[PDB]
DNA sequence: GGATTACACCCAAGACACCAGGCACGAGACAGAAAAAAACAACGAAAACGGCCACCACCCAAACACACCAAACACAAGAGCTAATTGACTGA
């Protein structure tokens, strides 16, 4: 488990899904901190594919896969690649709430 | 009553004379000065020994100046006017 440093996902929990051997970027699973392009022209909430398909805009659909604004990849839950220098790989220690979410 | 005038009188010059006190020599011996050996203070030579006393700091108790600091500066009342992040950094 890691936490991103920059962007709109500062100090947000990310589950390390796949470690790419290239030692450049690692695939991370995140909860979308987005408003589905409704007010902007945000808390952590479950990803609503139908909402972003109804609102339209920059969106590409592959059934359970999605590519939307910000070059953001989502599946079923964002699965996006970020550099290890942009995350912290030591000292996250998630709680039971994050286990349910992902002496 | 000092001195004079007059009237008895007893103490001693002088006499020889008795003779043992006194004086000119003589001897056993003795208190003492000449000489010598040994302690001794009078009086000046130092020294120690206090000894007040005038220093050299010594230490604390004001005396005085100065300067820095903080806190104060009458009540009420009405109205209007303006500001209350800010250029800009960095992913995207």
Can you tell me about this structure?
- The structure is cut from a larger assembly and holds one chain.
- The protein has 103 residues and is of the alpha+beta class.
- It is 13% helix and 31% strand.
- The strands form two sheets. It has a four-stranded antiparallel sheet, with no helix packed on it. A three-stranded antiparallel sheet has the order 4-5-6, with helices on one face.
- It is globular and about 50 Å long.
- It starts with a strand and ends with a helix.
- The protein binds one DNA strand of 92 nucleotides through loops.
The end-to-end span amounts to 23 Å
Q: In what range is the share of β-strand residues?
A: 25-35%
Strand order of the largest sheet: 1-2-3-7
Helix content: 10-25%
Taken from the alpha-carbon principal axes, the silhouette is globular
Count the beta strands: 7
H/E topology pattern: EEEHEEEEH
Instruction: Report the total helices.
Output: 2
């Amino acid at each position: 488990w890691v936490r991103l440093k920059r962007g709109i996902y500062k100090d947000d929990i990310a589950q390390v899904d796949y470690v790419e051997p290239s030692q450049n970027t690692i695939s991370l699973k995140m909860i979308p901190r987005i408003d589905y392009d409704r007010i902007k022209a945000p808390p952590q909430r479950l990803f609503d594919a139908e909402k972003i398909r109804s609102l339209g805009g920059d969106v590409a659909s592959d059934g359970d896969f999605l590519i939307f604004e910000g070059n953001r990849y989502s599946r079923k839950f964002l699965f996006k690649s970020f550099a290890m220098s942009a995350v912290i790989t030591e000292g996250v220690k998630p709680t039971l709430s994050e286990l349910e979410k992902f002496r």
